[PDB]
Design an enzyme around this catalytic site. Structure first.
Site, PDB file in Angstrom:
ATOM      1  N   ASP A 351       0.840  -1.214   0.000  1.00  0.00           N
ATOM      2  CA  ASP A 351       0.000   0.000   0.000  1.00  0.00           C
ATOM      3  C   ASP A 351       0.858   1.240   0.000  1.00  0.00           C
ATOM      4  O   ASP A 351       2.037   1.217   0.475  1.00  0.00           O
ATOM      5  CB  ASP A 351      -0.901   0.084   1.251  1.00  0.00           C
ATOM      6  N   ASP A 703      -2.298  -0.623   5.857  1.00  0.00           N
ATOM      7  CA  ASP A 703      -2.698   0.053   7.073  1.00  0.00           C
ATOM      8  C   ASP A 703      -4.167   0.402   7.015  1.00  0.00           C
ATOM      9  O   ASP A 703      -4.832   0.524   8.090  1.00  0.00           O
ATOM     10  CB  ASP A 703      -1.922   1.348   7.262  1.00  0.00           C
ATOM     11  N   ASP A 707      -6.981  -2.448   2.558  1.00  0.00           N
ATOM     12  CA  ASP A 707      -5.916  -3.450   2.372  1.00  0.00           C
ATOM     13  C   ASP A 707      -6.242  -4.825   2.983  1.00  0.00           C
ATOM     14  O   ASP A 707      -5.490  -5.801   2.822  1.00  0.00           O
ATOM     15  CB  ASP A 707      -4.565  -2.949   2.933  1.00  0.00           C
ATOM     16  N   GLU A 908      32.635 -36.783  14.497  1.00  0.00           N
ATOM     17  CA  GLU A 908      31.310 -36.167  14.457  1.00  0.00           C
ATOM     18  C   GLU A 908      31.359 -34.697  14.844  1.00  0.00           C
ATOM     19  O   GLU A 908      30.755 -33.855  14.180  1.00  0.00           O
ATOM     20  CB  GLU A 908      30.328 -36.924  15.353  1.00  0.00           C
TER      21      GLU A 908
HETATM   22  N1  LIG Z   1     -12.380  10.918   3.603  1.00  0.00           N
HETATM   23  C1  LIG Z   1     -12.368  11.144   2.267  1.00  0.00           C
HETATM   24  N2  LIG Z   1     -13.309  11.910   1.669  1.00  0.00           N
HETATM   25  C2  LIG Z   1     -13.304  12.133   0.338  1.00  0.00           C
HETATM   26  N3  LIG Z   1     -12.348  11.619  -0.475  1.00  0.00           N
HETATM   27  C3  LIG Z   1     -11.347  10.841  -0.001  1.00  0.00           C
HETATM   28  C4  LIG Z   1     -11.287  10.566   1.434  1.00  0.00           C
HETATM   29  N4  LIG Z   1     -10.213   9.778   1.638  1.00  0.00           N
HETATM   30  C5  LIG Z   1      -9.649   9.565   0.428  1.00  0.00           C
HETATM   31  N5  LIG Z   1     -10.323  10.206  -0.541  1.00  0.00           N
HETATM   32  C6  LIG Z   1     -10.009  10.217  -1.988  1.00  0.00           C
HETATM   33  O1  LIG Z   1     -10.390   8.942  -2.527  1.00  0.00           O
HETATM   34  C7  LIG Z   1      -9.316   8.411  -3.320  1.00  0.00           C
HETATM   35  C8  LIG Z   1      -9.279   6.888  -3.202  1.00  0.00           C
HETATM   36  O2  LIG Z   1      -9.322   6.480  -1.828  1.00  0.00           O
HETATM   37  P1  LIG Z   1      -8.546   5.141  -1.383  1.00  0.00           P
HETATM   38  O3  LIG Z   1      -8.544   4.921   0.111  1.00  0.00           O
HETATM   39  O4  LIG Z   1      -9.065   4.120  -2.402  1.00  0.00           O
HETATM   40  O5  LIG Z   1      -6.969   5.615  -1.778  1.00  0.00           O
HETATM   41  P2  LIG Z   1      -5.966   6.409  -0.745  1.00  0.00           P
HETATM   42  O6  LIG Z   1      -5.378   7.448  -1.750  1.00  0.00           O
HETATM   43  O7  LIG Z   1      -6.624   7.254   0.311  1.00  0.00           O
HETATM   44  C9  LIG Z   1      -5.003   5.396   0.112  1.00  0.00           C
HETATM   45  P3  LIG Z   1      -3.829   4.276  -0.235  1.00  0.00           P
HETATM   46  O8  LIG Z   1      -2.532   4.864  -1.039  1.00  0.00           O
HETATM   47  O9  LIG Z   1      -3.318   3.656   1.124  1.00  0.00           O
HETATM   48  O10 LIG Z   1      -4.483   3.259  -1.170  1.00  0.00           O
HETATM   49  C10 LIG Z   1      -8.049   9.122  -2.851  1.00  0.00           C
HETATM   50  O11 LIG Z   1      -7.039   9.264  -3.868  1.00  0.00           O
HETATM   51  C11 LIG Z   1      -8.554  10.461  -2.367  1.00  0.00           C
HETATM   52  O12 LIG Z   1      -8.653  11.313  -3.496  1.00  0.00           O
HETATM   53 CA   LIG Z   2      25.268 -38.892  16.001  1.00  0.00          CA
HETATM   54 CA   LIG Z   3      -3.342   3.676   3.826  1.00  0.00          CA
END
Ligand SMILES: Nc1ncnc2c1ncn2[C@@H]1O[C@H](COP(=O)(O)OP(=O)(O)CP(=O)(O)O)[C@@H](O)[C@H]1O
Ligand SMILES: [Ca+2]
Ligand SMILES: [Ca+2]
Ligand SMILES: [Ca+2]
Ligand code: NA
Length: 994
Positions: A351, A703, A707, A908
């Site tokens: 991740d 995390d 995942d 041995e």
């Molecule tokens: N609480 C929230 N409200 C609105 N949009 C959010 C949000 N948290 C994340 N996002 C947006 O949603 C997209 C996809 O979320 P997701 O959790 O799938 O990827 P991530 O970028 O947060 C984490 P990771 O790199 O660990 O996969 C992110 O790129 C971000 O733009």
């Molecule tokens: Ca032995």
């Molecule tokens: Ca994360």
């Protein structure tokens, strides 16, 4: 609170005398802490290691010896008064081996279990509550929660204590109750009470059980019970029914346990038979069975000698050592297979956010529209200072600290950031630092609005704790948040439904404040906002908005980007069905673009190095993230997954581009691609799966709740200690340290355990085989008895004890982490290794007869120079006129056997020195390398001398001391075993390495 699922929200609130949104007053906590005690359970310690001893004598191999020692006591009372002194010593030589290994085992085990408990206790678990102390939810130690205070939990969280749900802020709340009720799929929760006060846990659709996890949504609740009164703590010690299985490698070796137990069992009855004619001799008594019971004991002894009794222990030990060496680096090993399995890892899926990166979010850049006219579009960019979640910093337009509320576009921008956010900020008085509550991406926004202070609110006179949510609250008081269309990864956005506060408060009607992945949000906008103005989204504006997103994202700071919009005229509250999060995207349409924020999330220090080392160990590192492809590839370069100028057309894919390939193509893409972006939680799981269809041992690091599937799917999943409970629940190992490096160390350690098992096997087999071929070469050349029952048991205890177990402490090989991963196909005992066994075993077998024969044949200065024709000795009482004045008793002499038993032990201990490595030289990897082995070599070498020079012993063990020049022989014939393997090591080092 008893049966809180039966009474309403009001009944429970009043019952404790708490205001729903305020929480307990400091004096209510003092008082409640006394009446109810802390929220915890009686820890687990270790007085009598008795239960840890029973397990040492449970394996198959040790039980056979346990039986052997038992039978050798049945003959103790059936022994004639002449050599009884040697009939009772037997059982104690079969037990002394077992007991010594039992010690090292149980001892090693107690050490591991201790470093573990010292790592698990290290970090106190926190909880989120509302206390009258503070307007915003504060973070406290979990063990400080008392029944009565209002507790907050969201997706990812672990329920801190049995809770009665007061309010569910999201459109749904799901829970992983597997640990308790046993149900697999996450269950839905509600706020209405269940009348039946006897109802089972599965019917308490309004409670949240300590130790379970929120699978989805956010919710406010009042604590019913804590500590030992939790339906989790009431079944603690009264459970312990988690039957620990056995690691794949263990079963593999214990399988190899019977595979030798069958073979050895045979060669024994293959002795009791090749001597049916000796059962009646002048020597072994004379009776028709008195001689049969003897050779029965030559068998049973050769068995005990041959059987590897240290195998189970040494494996068990090396494992405890692993858990321990990992715990030393703050890595909790939740499953014994982990280290072992990580050894075979060929691909580490990982991740990005909060795993490869630090998840320390802070908005450093932001922009709204400035001017729109024809094909010309301009933005007002700003810069924000401060990197922590502290509300300390400035907004700079052109190097000048600017007053945010001067730009209408920023007023909205902030309004959204504050309203469309399920997170807050809390100040830690103890650490003197501002800590987030909820998701970093979101708290980042919280701090931003505090820095923005758009309504020029007076904050200068507020305690560090109040300053934390001041301006955020100000904005809330201006809009009522009706409901929230919680965040979903298919839409990649999140919205919030609001209406003005009083009769006034900008009474333009209703609004929805949206925020999310820039692509998705920008496409669902038909208007850009200019100040308070509004104009239609056009190609040029879109083109511009996007280009600056692309810059910040792929740029040097590789910023994480988020779009902010509002739906100026939402649907009617009623026209919206809030049960299907799939319908949410449409309610987020006809949006008005407000602005963008770019946040920094610096990658971890050790990630770059760690990846390079993985490369050397023949281990790939794929990036799996929801974040924008651009910011991904950018980072991948920064951390060294991609070259700084590498073409990545075939090696980087969005979830969409990936789903566009046919399946067979998606599979292949996993083999070459190293970066997947804007990919869903089902995707990460699918990627990992693909890798596995090529029969590779796959790991997953993360995390997030996104995942969990991947982590579970992967052979071994590794969670960040900073991550979510759910991610951790799905993992085989947690990096409490958050140190990405430990993953590599674990991999090295897992290759170590294996090689240590190899040398341990290589030693025990090459050795114990020479022992058998010493006896079968004896009966075959006609020469007299080479050894006797106890003389075997002795060589046993002295060659298959601490000297063998110590091998488990062999350090890592010189190139362990420079060879590719071990193919899971590769068989335990190589074809070339079995030659090595017989080639070494054959020498020591013929080097032990050649020594007892040297006492007869070319018996230099040794009393009894029979010379040529020794093959015949049974014909002395019938043909003395063949030997010149030679007493027929020199054949029953204890001196030839003593020469043999000494060459055995000695050759041995020399051979064990060969077992410090598989294919490395004894000069490249010096014998002094493993000190623990030397100390054992000497404990045995010495333990043997006590038999040769301490009056009562050489009698019992039927032996006679050797001249200081006969030892020169023992050595002259033993020491060259080193040169033989050295050649065999040279062969496999210049022709067959793998
Ligand atoms: N609480 C929230 N409200 C609105 N949009 C959010 C949000 N948290 C994340 N996002 C947006 O949603 C997209 C996809 O979320 P997701 O959790 O799938 O990827 P991530 O970028 O947060 C984490 P990771 O790199 O660990 O996969 C992110 O790129 C971000 O733009
Ligand atoms: Ca032995
Ligand atoms: Ca994360
Ligand atoms: Ca043995
Ligand atoms: Na798994």
């Amino acid at each position: 609170m008893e049966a809180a699922h039966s009474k309403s929200t009001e009944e429970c609130l009043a019952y404790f005398g708490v205001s729903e949104t305020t929480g307990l007053t400091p004096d209510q906590v003092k008082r409640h802490l006394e009446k109810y005690g802390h929220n915890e359970l009686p820890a687990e310690e270790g007085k009598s290691l008795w239960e840890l001893v029973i397990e040492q004598f449970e394996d198959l191999l040790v039980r056979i010896l346990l039986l052997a020692a038992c039978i050798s006591f049945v003959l103790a009372w059936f022994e004639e008064g002449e050599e009884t002194i040697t009939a009772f010593v037997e059982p104690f030589v079969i037990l002394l081996i077992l007991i010594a290994n039992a010690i090292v085992g149980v001892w090693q085990e107690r050490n591991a279990e201790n470093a573990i408990e010292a790592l698990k206790e290290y970090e106190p678990e926190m909880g989120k509550v509302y206390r009258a102390d503070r307007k915003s939810v504060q973070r406290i130690k979990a063990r400080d929660i008392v029944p009565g205070d209002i507790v907050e939990v969201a997706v990812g969280d672990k329920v801190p204590a049995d809770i009665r749900i007061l309010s569910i802020k999201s459109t749904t709340l799901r829970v992983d109750q597997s640990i308790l009720t046993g149900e697999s799929v996450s269950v839905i929760k509600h706020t209405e009470p269940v009348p039946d006060p006897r109802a089972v846990n599965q019917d308490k659709k309004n409670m949240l059980f300590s130790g379970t996890n929120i699978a989805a949504g956010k919710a406010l609740g009042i604590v019913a019970t804590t500590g030992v009164s939790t339906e989790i703590g009431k079944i603690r010690d009264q459970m312990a029914a988690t039957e620990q299985d056995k690691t794949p490698l263990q079963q593999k070796l214990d399988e190899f346990g019977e595979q030798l137990s069958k073979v050895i069992s045979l060669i024994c009855v293959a002795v009791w038979l090749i001597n049916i004619g000796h059962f009646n001799d002048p020597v072994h008594g004379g009776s028709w069975i008195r001689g049969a019971i003897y050779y029965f004991k030559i068998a049973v002894a050769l068995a005990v000698a041959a059987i590897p009794e240290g195998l189970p222990a040494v494996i068990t030990t090396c494992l405890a050592l692993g858990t321990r060496r990992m715990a030393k680096k703050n890595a909790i090993v939740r499953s014994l297979p982990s280290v072992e399995t990580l050894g075979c890892t060929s691909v580490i899926c990982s991740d990005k956010t909060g795993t490869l990166t630090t998840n320390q979010m802070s908005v450093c850049k932001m922009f709204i529209i400035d001017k729109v006219d024809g094909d010309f579009c301009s933005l007002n960019e700003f810069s924000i200072t401060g990197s922590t979640y502290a509300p300390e910093g400035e907004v700079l337009k052109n190097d000048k600290p600017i007053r945010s509320g001067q730009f209408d576009g920023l007023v909205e921008l902030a309004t959204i950031c504050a309203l469309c956010n399920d997170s807050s900020l809390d100040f830690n008085e103890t650490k003197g630092v501002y800590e987030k509550v909820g998701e970093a991406t979101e708290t980042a926004l919280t701090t931003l609005v505090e820095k923005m202070n758009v309504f020029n609110t007076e904050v200068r006179n507020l305690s560090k704790v109040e300053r934390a949510n001041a301006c955020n609250s100000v904005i809330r008081q201006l809009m009522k948040k009706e409901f929230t269309l919680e965040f979903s990864r298919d839409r990649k956005s999140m919205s919030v439904y609001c209406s003005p506060a009083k009769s006034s408060r900008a009474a333009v009607g209703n609004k929805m404040f949206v925020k999310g992945a820039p692509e998705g949000v920008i496409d669902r906008c038909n208007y850009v906002r200019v100040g308070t103005t509004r104009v239609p989204m056009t190609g040029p504006v879109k083109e511009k908005i996007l280009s600056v997103i692309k810059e910040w994202g792929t740029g040097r700071d590789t910023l994480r980007c988020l779009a902010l919009a509002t739906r100026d005229t939402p649907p009617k509250r009623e026209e919206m069905v809030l049960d299907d999060s799939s319908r949410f995207m449409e309610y987020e349409t006809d949006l008005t673009f407000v602005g963008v924020v770019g946040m920094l999330d610096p990658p971890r220090k050790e990630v770059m190095g760690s990846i390079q080392l993985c490369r050397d160990a023949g281990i790939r590192v794929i990036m799996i993230t929801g974040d924008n492809k651009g910011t991904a590839i950018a980072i991948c370069r920064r951390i060294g997954i991609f070259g700084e100028n590498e073409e990545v057309a075939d090696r980087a894919y969005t979830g969409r581009e990936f789903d566009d390939l046919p399946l067979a193509e998606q599979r292949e893409a996993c083999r070459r691609a190293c970066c997947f972006a804007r990919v869903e939680p089902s995707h990460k799981s699918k990627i990992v799966e693909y890798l596995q269809s090529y029969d590779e041992i796959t790991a997953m690091t993360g995390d997030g709740v996104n995942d969990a599937p991947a982590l579970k799917k992967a052979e071994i999943g590794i969670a960040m200690g900073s991550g979510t409970a759910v991610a951790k629940t799905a993992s085989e190992m947690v990096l409490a340290d958050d140190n990405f490096s430990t993953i590599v160390a674990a991999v090295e350690e897992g290759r170590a355990i294996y090689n240590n098992m190899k040398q341990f096997i290589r030693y025990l087999i090459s050795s114990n085989v020479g022992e058998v071929v010493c006896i079968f070469l004896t009966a075959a050349l006609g020469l007299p008895e080479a050894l006797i029952p106890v003389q075997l048991l002795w060589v046993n205890l002295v060659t298959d004890g601490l000297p063998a177990t110590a091998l488990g402490f062999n350090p890592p090989d010189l190139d362990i982490m420079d060879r590719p991963p071990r193919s899971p196909k590769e068989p335990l005992i190589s074809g070339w290794l079995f030659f090595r066994y017989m080639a070494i075993g054959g020498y020591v077998g013929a080097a032990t007869v050649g020594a007892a024969a040297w006492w007869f044949m070319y018996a230099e200065d040794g009393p009894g120079v029979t010379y040529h024709q020794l093959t015949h000795f049974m014909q002395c009482t019938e043909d003395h006129p063949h030997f010149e004045g030679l007493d027929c008793e020199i054949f029953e002499a204890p001196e030839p056997m003593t020469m043999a038993l000494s060459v055995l032990v000695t050759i041995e201990m020399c051979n064990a020195l060969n077992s410090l490595s598989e294919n490395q030289s004894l000069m490249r990897m010096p014998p002094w390398v493993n000190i623990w082995l030397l100390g054992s070599i000497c404990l045995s070498m010495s333990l043997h001398f006590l038999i040769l020079y301490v009056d009562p012993l050489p009698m019992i063990f039927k032996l006679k001391a050797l001249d200081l020049t006969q030892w020169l022989m023992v050595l002259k014939i033993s020491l060259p075993v080193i040169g033989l393997d050295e050649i065999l090591k040279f062969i496999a080092r210049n022709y067959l390495e793998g």
